[PDB]
């Protein structure tokens, strides 16, 4: 980043933001990973055991990426509108 004695670009521009501690422990889940776990019921413990989110994760969302084909029960996870539509279209059930 040195440009001669002239004030470098990474010092001419101002700093912004802050690092969120919640984002380091919040993950997102593709629709394709739902079939990979066993038992048909997804939550934090089963996803960690199946190595999908991470041991330190405390919150997780299911996203409309890929597609699910088998009935699956989502429990205690936030779900997007498109993901919810696909899950219910595939005979699923979402609870809190």
């Amino acid at each position: 980043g040195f440009e001669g004695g002239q004030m470098p670009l990474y010092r001419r521009l101002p700093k912004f933001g802050f690092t969120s501690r919640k984002a380091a422990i919040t993950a997102e889940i593709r629709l394709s990973d739902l079939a990979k776990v066993e038992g048909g019921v997804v939550d934090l413990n089963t996803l960690k055991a199946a190595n999908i989110i991470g041991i330190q994760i405390e919150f997780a969302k299911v996203i409309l990426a890929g597609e699910v084909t088998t009935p699956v029960t989502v429990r205690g996870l936030r779900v997007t509108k498109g993901a919810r539509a696909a899950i219910e279209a595939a005979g699923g059930k979402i609870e809190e």
Partner: protein, 64 residues
Amino acid sequence: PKIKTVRGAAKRFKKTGKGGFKHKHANLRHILTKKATKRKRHLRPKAMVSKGDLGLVIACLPYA
């Protein structure tokens, strides 16, 4: 050993989807009453790093 990131650069840039970098505009930290409100408004949204100085930010941030 691993390359050390330039922490000043890390507090100012973030990689986007296609590989570019976003940054905050300059001239908005202090003396503002003499600047036209149109200029301040245009300086509020974040911008993308230019092609000329893209190499320096990629060099300064080896770990995205």
